[PDB]
Amino acid sequence: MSLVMESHSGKSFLLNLLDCPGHVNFNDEVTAAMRLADGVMLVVDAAEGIMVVTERAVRQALQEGLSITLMISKVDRLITELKLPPADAYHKLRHTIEEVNNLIAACCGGEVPPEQLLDPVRGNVTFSAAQSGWSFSLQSFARLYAEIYGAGFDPREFAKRLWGDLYFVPEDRVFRRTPPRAGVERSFVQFVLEPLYKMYSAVIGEHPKTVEGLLAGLGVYLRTATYNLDTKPLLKEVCSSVLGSCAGVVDMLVAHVPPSRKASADKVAAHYSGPSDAPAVSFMSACNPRGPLVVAVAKLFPRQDCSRFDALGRVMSGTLRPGDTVKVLGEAYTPEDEEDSAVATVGSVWVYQARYRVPVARATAGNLVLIEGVDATITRTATLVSDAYDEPVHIFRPLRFQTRSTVKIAAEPLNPSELPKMVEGLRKVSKSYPLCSTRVEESGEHTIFGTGEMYLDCLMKDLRELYAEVEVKVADPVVAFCETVVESSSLKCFA
Amino acid sequence: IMTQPINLMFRFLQSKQKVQIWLFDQADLRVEGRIIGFDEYMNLVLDEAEEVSMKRKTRKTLGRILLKGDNITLIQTTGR
Amino acid sequence: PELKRFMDKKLSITLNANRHVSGTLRGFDQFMNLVLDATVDEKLKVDIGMVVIRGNSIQTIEALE
Amino acid sequence: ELEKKEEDEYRTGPLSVLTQSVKTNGQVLINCRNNHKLLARVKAFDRHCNMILENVKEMWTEIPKTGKGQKASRPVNKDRFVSKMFLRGDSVIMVLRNPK
Amino acid sequence: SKLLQYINFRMRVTLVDSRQIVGRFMAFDRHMNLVLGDSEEFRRLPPKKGKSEEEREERRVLGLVLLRGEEIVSLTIEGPPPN
Amino acid sequence: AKGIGIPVKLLHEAEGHVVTVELKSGEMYRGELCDAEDNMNCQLKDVTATGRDGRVTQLAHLFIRGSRVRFFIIPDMLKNAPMFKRIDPK
Amino acid sequence: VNPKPFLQDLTGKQVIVKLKWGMEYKGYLVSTDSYMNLQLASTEEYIDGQFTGQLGEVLIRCNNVMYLRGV
Amino acid sequence: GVEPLLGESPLYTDNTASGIALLWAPPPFNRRSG
Amino acid sequence: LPVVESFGFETDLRYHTQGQAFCQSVFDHWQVVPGDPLDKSIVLRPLEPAPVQALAREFMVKTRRRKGMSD
Amino acid sequence: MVKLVRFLMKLANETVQIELKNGTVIQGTIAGVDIAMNTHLKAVKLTARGKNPVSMDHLSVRGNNIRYYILPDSLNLDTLLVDIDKPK
């Protein structure tokens, strides 16, 4: 979904956010979106810190050379469940970003690349309680301070100071590296978190007239029909008032994420395998909208009939239009043997908004979009290059997951009279599940290869209901056994 | 050394090298003198000031003047 | 301000009554005062050293790079 | 508190010549930004040097355009009267109280 | 302001250098900034005797323009809102 | 933000495009605005300078003081800004 | 010397306010405001440097000032 | 004089604990209204 | 915990903890199945699991038997 | 809050004249003056420097390029002069 969101400058940026599954056995989905987008937002929940899928997607993020941006979500669990005081909340938040930064350091080489190191002072980390309806960065917070208190400084140099072991001296209205008194807290706890805690408990322990006075103190004025809602709805409305439009997100990513002009260049340089001396790689490297359209269709999405799959991919070169002819370059495409590619048409191109589709008459270079009429030859991913190009053509490298389909199951349709649609189901399953693998043996039965419990679970569900409607008996699961050596053979074997 | 402009003005005052200041829309007339004071409105209290009319190259001694900032164009050092 | 993207770079600064001074930037203010190193008067062909220009004394600035 | 320090800024400050001119109704001649000189008496003013003027006669020197090749004309003295006028302080270059 | 009555209404602008700008009204700022859709510059050339003042004022087409109030001197209506 | 009028946020959302700048001196400046100020100080790149005498010059970058600038010429593409549509009668 | 110390120490002194247009008024600095518009007492006039007449006590606006000197 | 955004309100109140208890209460006691 | 041994593990882990625990499993690496995989010195049980000493044996054995091969 | 724009914004429906900074003459009725001294006039005629008059049903003029106002001779000044010291 790409949303037209606002900056502090009022300049609206179009942000293509791709909501991913976070359960481990769905890492397949992840890599697709990650090879789609040049930037990533890692949402680490303030409460439980780092977990498996977080840092595994972090390795995914550094391997594919991405703009990694930290979103500390669920900060309210600090206030309400754990009830950790503002100071220990500073410690826990700091420790979570420190854990992300150090597990970046591990794989990036034990040192933190200076354009990659996440700390809020330069505005990469942003805090979130999405449920309670608010999120910010120190930028957004400092700017908010400037707005409510009168135009009395540059919010930039403020956010420069609100983080760290900085302690505000009431003595002279300046921040210090040293605790001016005995017991004073940091600048973050006080100037950020003390207000947040006060906001939370002026909602979650106090008369709605106390809330209306606590915010009529501040400029924000509610509607006296918002001081009726329960503790969670009133909490959301009150924080969304004095934490407003999420500018931390736009003014975070649109800063720490390059646009399409620069993203496609390294995208292909590390992602294209065909010769980069050709004009096509340079047409991408400018993201020139007028050149030979090169699209990297890395995901396909089934529809309301479950007959054909729209093709989600990034138009990174040229300008597509509904009604084109293209050679869709599949998986095993070869410059010497063009067996594995199909010429096809474009029906209609959209922009996807996660509940509906918007028809888009032209698909700009650098725009991730939904294409109609291409699925017949796409199994996992492909490239799109117009037939209007008479140049040698190659493909974007397939997805190199973090995970492997280590688990295998057997599949025998209860009725053999429907094994065609069964495999067609399996076939159409090989449509939507990047890590799905269908393998036929000397035994002849179709074994299917997934990450583990939930991935095979939901693939069996969608096989049962989405594509085939033929109910199939699956034996006990079993996994793949490799075959290694202990120590070398004592004799040289001949054939 | 990426130094603040106000620190260069501190330089101009305490070093008391004689400088030339250009005036607003005044390509005909410059003012040389030694900076002995200034504010954040950067009106310049100047010693030994003489005003240069370059076209005939005539220099008019004014002495200790207080130059209005609102006419200031350029603070250049009259060094060799 | 975007003058921050210019730090320590050779510039061409145009001023009131059609004047050009070209010098590597040294710093600026909110009032857009500019301090320059090795500034050259392009009219009379003179390198005028380190300078400060006033805010409304800045019509435009170009980056020769 | 702003108003009283404003009042003494009018009172001991330099514009007080006009404040005097308000209470003594003395005639003041003002130099304009385009050199049209207005003799009148001040009724009231502000911190913008904008004025309510009474009995206003503005006078200027108009040099009419000659035909190309012929001598620059003699400058002609022209004055025009209005009973009451507003003056904007950005047109004001100088205010002169008449010695009376 | 009453120039809220005037958004979408086609208008003409005078500059201090006496150049003429004709476009339609989109948005206005406190600083007397304006947003002119379909704007064109009519610049008055000197009137060379024997020709109408009305028939040779140099028209340039500027397209969409935005106007800073500092040199904005005078605004009038040119026509109705176009259809 | 609160306090700021529409057309300067128009200028901001014009970011990343190629526009034209007329200043009170009469010369024309066509280039890609990088970003601009509340005080209309702006930075364009890929700069075409059209001097008072028709002079066409190539400038890599430009920083333009706003109170020096007369008007801006902006793609009607961006005249589809949400302010434009939202205020619109229809 | 901050300009406010200079102005208040020049108080009552013989001082010249030369204007950006070239006019110079030489007279007694009676008082100054927060905005550096000037009171002048028994003021002499000069345009092109040559004396043109006395105006007595005159008020000049700040934006009309080029610079001012102690005599 | 920007100071603290909310320096005039107590960080914690005796009722705050009760409010938290209400938040982590079984269905009827979650709510203020119904 | 090996992937073979992950079969129903999240469940039983929740079930003998009443669910206060929640575990995640990702593929990590390979390592060697204990025993002798080609072995014949152990003739094994149907329907009952073999011990550590017979796994590698019966594992590739049932592998072959499913894949369509003789023992 | 200055005295004089305080006085000027009550010039609503005043049929008055105006001189511009460059010498243009305008006679018309004040529909509004605002805190920036910008005036919108009705029942107007504007006559440029050396130009023929042209009439306007309505006109807008910036507060800054205003040279001055010519007020009616029929003006009860001391009516509109009270209250200028009153903050609202």
F36: phi then psi, degrees, rounded to nearest 5? -130, 170
Helix axes A247-256, A138-148, angle to 10 degrees: 130
Partner-chain residue, chosen from J8, J21, J64, that has the shortest CB–CB distance to D86: J8
Q: Alpha-carbon distance A415 to A427, whole Å?
A: 17
Which residues are registered as beta bridge partners of D58? D38, D80
Exposed / middle / buried, residue I68 (Cβ in 10 Å: 0-12, 13-18, 19+):
exposed
Q: Alpha-carbon distance A118 to E23, whole Å?
A: 49
| Window 17-46 of G, Cβ < 8 Å to B | 20, 36
Answer whether A167's CB lies under 8 Å from A183's CB.
no
Size of interface A-I (CB pairs under 8 A): 49
Instruction: Give me the amino acid identity at E21.
Output: I
Q: Alpha-carbon distance D87 to D45, whole Å?
A: 9
Answer whether D43's CB lies under 8 Å from D25's CB.
no
**E35's tokens:** 């947003």
Instruction: Give me the amino acid identity at A313.
Output: G
- Residue-wise burial string across B1-35, b where 16 or more C-beta atoms lie within 10 A, e elsewhere: eeeebbebbebbbeeeebbbbbbbbbbebbbbbbb
Answer whether D10's CB lies under 8 Å from D19's CB.
yes
Exposed / middle / buried, residue F27 (Cβ in 10 Å: 0-12, 13-18, 19+):
middle
D55: helix, strand or coil? strand
Beta strands of G5-37 (E only): which ranges?
A: 14-19, 24-32
- CB-based contact, D62 to chain J, within 8 Å: no
What element of type H or E holds D81?
strand D76-87
Chain B: closest CA distance from residue G55 (Å): 23
8 Å CB contact of G59 and D12: no
Q: Alpha-carbon distance C16 to C32, whole Å?
A: 14
Helix axes A155-162, A138-148, angle to 10 degrees: 130
A218: phi then psi, degrees, rounded to nearest 5? -75, 165
How many CA atoms within 13 Å lie on the side-chain side of A35? 29
Q: Alpha-carbon distance A72 to C13, whole Å?
A: 45
Q: Which of A450, A442, A439 is nearest to I65 (CA)?
A: A442
D3: phi then psi, degrees, rounded to nearest 5? -70, -40
DSSP output for B39-80: -TT--EEEEEEEEEETTTTEEEEEEEEEE-GGGEEEEEE---
Q: Alpha-carbon distance A429 to E77, whole Å?
A: 66
Answer whether B47's CB lies under 8 Å from B32's CB.
no
8 Å CB contact of A10 and F9: yes
Chain H: closest CA distance from residue A231 (Å): 7
Q: Alpha-carbon distance G30 to G28, whole Å?
A: 6
- CB-based contact, A81 to chain H, within 8 Å: yes
- CB-based contact, J81 to chain D, within 8 Å: yes
Q: Alpha-carbon distance A393 to C28, whole Å?
A: 51
Breaks (C-N over 2.5 A) in chain F follow: none
Helix axes D2-11, D16-24, angle to 10 degrees: 80
Answer whether B76's CB lies under 8 Å from B20's CB.
yes
| Window 18-47 of I, Cβ < 8 Å to A | 24-27, 30, 32-33
**Chain J residues whose beta carbon lies within 8 Å of the beta carbon of residue E18:** 22
Beta strands of E1-83 (E only): which ranges?
A: 10-15, 20-28, 34-43, 58-67, 72-77
**A69's tokens:** 């941006």
Find the radius of gyration of the CA atoms of chain I: 16
Q: In 10 A of CB A214, how many CB atoms?
A: 20
Q: Which of D56, D54, D92, D58 is nearest to D78 (CA)?
A: D58
Q: Which of C8, H9, C47 is nearest to C34 (CA)?
A: C8
Q: Alpha-carbon distance A265 to A287, whole Å?
A: 7
Answer whether A155's CB lies under 8 Å from A52's CB.
no
Instruction: Give me the amino acid identity at F16.
Output: G
Q: Which of A69, A62, A91, A64 is nearest to A78 (CA)?
A: A91
Share in percent of chain J as helix, strand, coil (round to 5): 10, 45, 45
Q: In 10 A of CB A457, how many CB atoms?
A: 12
Helix axes A194-201, A86-108, angle to 10 degrees: 120
Exposed / middle / buried, residue G43 (Cβ in 10 Å: 0-12, 13-18, 19+):
buried
The CA-based angle F25-F31-F32, given to 5 degrees, is 135
Answer whether A211's CB lies under 8 Å from A202's CB.
yes
- CB-based contact, J35 to chain D, within 8 Å: no
Region of residue A123 (phi > 0: left; psi between -120 and 50: alpha; otherwise: beta): left
DSSP output for C7-48: TT--EEEEETTTEEEEEEEEEE-TT--EEEEEEEETTTTEEE
Answer whether D52's CB lies under 8 Å from D70's CB.
no
Which residues are registered as beta bridge partners of E37? E24
Q: Which of B21, A128, J78 is nearest to C48 (CA)?
A: B21
| Sequence-separated (6 or more) residues with CB below 8 Å from residue D96 | D28, D29, D30, D31, G55, G56, G58
Chain centroid to Cα B51, Å, comes to: 10
**B10's tokens:** 């501190």
Nearest CA in chain F to A219: F2
Q: Which of E4, E78, E79 is nearest to E34 (CA)?
A: E4
Instruction: Give me the amino acid identity at B79.
Output: G
Share in percent of chain I as helix, strand, coil (round to 5): 35, 0, 65
| Sequence-separated (6 or more) residues with CB below 8 Å from residue A421 | A468, A469, A470
Q: Alpha-carbon distance B9 to A285, whole Å?
A: 47
Q: Resolution (in Å) of the shown entry?
A: 2.6
B13: helix, strand or coil? helix
**A105's tokens:** 């350091």
Answer whether A339's CB lies under 8 Å from A329's CB.
no
How are beta strands D76-87 and J66-70 bridged, if at all?
A: antiparallel
How are beta strands A67-73 and A126-129 bridged, if at all?
A: parallel
Answer whether D72's CB lies under 8 Å from J58's CB.
no
Q: In 10 A of CB B60, how many CB atoms?
A: 12
Q: Which of A322, C60, D69, E6 is nearest to F44 (CA)?
A: C60
D47: phi then psi, degrees, rounded to nearest 5? -75, -5
- CB-based contact, J82 to chain D, within 8 Å: no
Q: Is there contact between J and D if contact means ≥3 C-beta pairs under 8 Å?
A: yes
Answer whether A42's CB lies under 8 Å from A60's CB.
no
How are beta strands A382-386 and D27-32 bridged, if at all?
A: unpaired
Q: What are the angstrom distances between the C-alpha of G22 and each of A308, A464, B30, G46, G52?
A: 84, 94, 13, 9, 13
Place of tokens 């006496």: E18
Answer whether E44's CB lies under 8 Å from J50's CB.
no
Q: Which of A192, A193, A200 is nearest to A158 (CA)?
A: A192
Which of A11, A15, A143, A154 is best to mutate for the F interface (most F CBs within 10 A)? A11
**A398's tokens:** 């397939």
The CA-based angle A172-A174-A177, given to 5 degrees, is 120
Q: Alpha-carbon distance F13 to A11, whole Å?
A: 4
Method of determination used here: cryo-EM
How many CA atoms within 13 Å lie on the side-chain side of A185? 18
Answer whether A192's CB lies under 8 Å from A200's CB.
no
- CB-based contact, J59 to chain E, within 8 Å: yes
E2: phi then psi, degrees, rounded to nearest 5? -85, -10
How are beta strands E10-15 and J66-70 bridged, if at all?
A: unpaired
Instruction: Give me the amino acid identity at H28.
Output: P
Instruction: Give me the amino acid identity at B70.
Output: D
How are beta strands B44-53 and B26-38 bridged, if at all?
A: antiparallel
| Sequence-separated (6 or more) residues with CB below 8 Å from residue J86 | none
- Residues in chain F, overall count: 90
**Chain D residues whose beta carbon lies within 8 Å of the beta carbon of residue J71:** 84-86
How are beta strands B58-67 and B72-77 bridged, if at all?
A: unpaired
List all chains that touch chain J, counting a touch as 3 or more CB pairs closer than 8 Å: D, E
Q: Which of H26, E78, E81 is nearest to F88 (CA)?
A: E81
Annotated binding site of A for GTP: 76, 131
A334: phi then psi, degrees, rounded to nearest 5? -135, 135
Nearest CA in chain A to F38: A9
Exposed / middle / buried, residue A162 (Cβ in 10 Å: 0-12, 13-18, 19+):
buried
Q: What are the angstrom distances between the C-alpha of A397 and each of A128, A268, A400, A460, F72?
A: 35, 9, 8, 28, 45
| Sequence-separated (6 or more) residues with CB below 8 Å from residue G66 | B23, B67, B68, B71, G17, G18, G19, G20, G21, G22
**Chain H residues whose beta carbon lies within 8 Å of the beta carbon of residue A194:** 4, 6-7, 11
- CA torsion, ordered A463, A465, A469, A470, to nearest 10 deg: 50
Find the radius of gyration of the CA atoms of chain H: 15
Q: Alpha-carbon distance A70 to A44, whole Å?
A: 7
Q: Which of E37, E42, E45 is nearest to E82 (CA)?
A: E37
Q: Alpha-carbon distance A256 to A259, whole Å?
A: 10
**Chain G residues whose beta carbon lies within 8 Å of the beta carbon of residue B23:** 20, 66
What element of type H or E holds F13?
helix F6-13
Chain A: closest CA distance from residue H2 (Å): 6
Look at the alpha carbons of A191, A192, A193, A194 in this order and tell me if their dihedral is positive or negative. positive
Q: Alpha-carbon distance A127 to A135, whole Å?
A: 5
Q: What are the angstrom distances between the C-alpha of A402 and each of A20, A36, A397?
A: 15, 16, 15
The 8-class DSSP code of residue J88 comes to -
Answer whether C21's CB lies under 8 Å from C29's CB.
no
Q: What are the angstrom distances between the C-alpha of A119 and each of A114, A495, E51, H20, J55?
A: 11, 62, 71, 31, 65
Exposed / middle / buried, residue G49 (Cβ in 10 Å: 0-12, 13-18, 19+):
exposed
- HEC sequence for chain A: CEEEECCCCCCCEEEECCCCCCCHHHHHHHHHHHHHCCEEEEEEECCCCCCHHHHHHHHHHHHCCCEEEEEEECCHHHHCCCCCCHHHHHHHHHHHHHHHHHHHHHHHCCCCCCCCCCCHHHCCCEEEECCCCEEECHHHHHHHHHHHCCCCCCHHHHHHHHCCCCEEECCCCEEECCCCCCCCCCHHHHHHHHHHHHHHHCCCCCCHHHHHHHHHHCCCCCCCCCCCCCHHHHHHHHHHHHHCCCHHHHHHHHHHCCCHHHHHHHHHHHHECCCCCCHHHHHHHCCCCCCCCEEEEEEEECCCCCCCCEEEEEEEECCECCCCEEEEECCCCCCCCCCCEEEEECCCCEEECCCCEEECCCECCCEEEEECCCHHHCCCCEEEEECCCCCCCCCECCCCCCCCCCEEEEEEECCHHHHHHHHHHHHHHHHHCCCCCEEECCCCCEEEEECCHHHHHHHHHHHHHHHCCCCEECCCCEECCCCCCCCCCCCCCCC
Q: In 10 A of CB J56, how many CB atoms?
A: 17
Long-range contacts, I5-11 (Cβ 8 Å, 24+): I6/A452, I6/A453, I7/A476, I7/A477, I10/A453
G32: helix, strand or coil? strand
Q: In 10 A of CB C18, how many CB atoms?
A: 11
Exposed / middle / buried, residue A154 (Cβ in 10 Å: 0-12, 13-18, 19+):
middle
Chain F: closest CA distance from residue C63 (Å): 5
| Distance between first and last Cα of chain A | 59
What element of type H or E holds F25?
none
DSSP output for H1-34: ----TT-SS-S--HHHHHHHHHHTS-HHHH-S--
| Distance between first and last Cα of chain B | 22
Q: In 10 A of CB C1, how many CB atoms?
A: 16
8 Å CB contact of F59 and C59: no
Answer whether F74's CB lies under 8 Å from F43's CB.
no
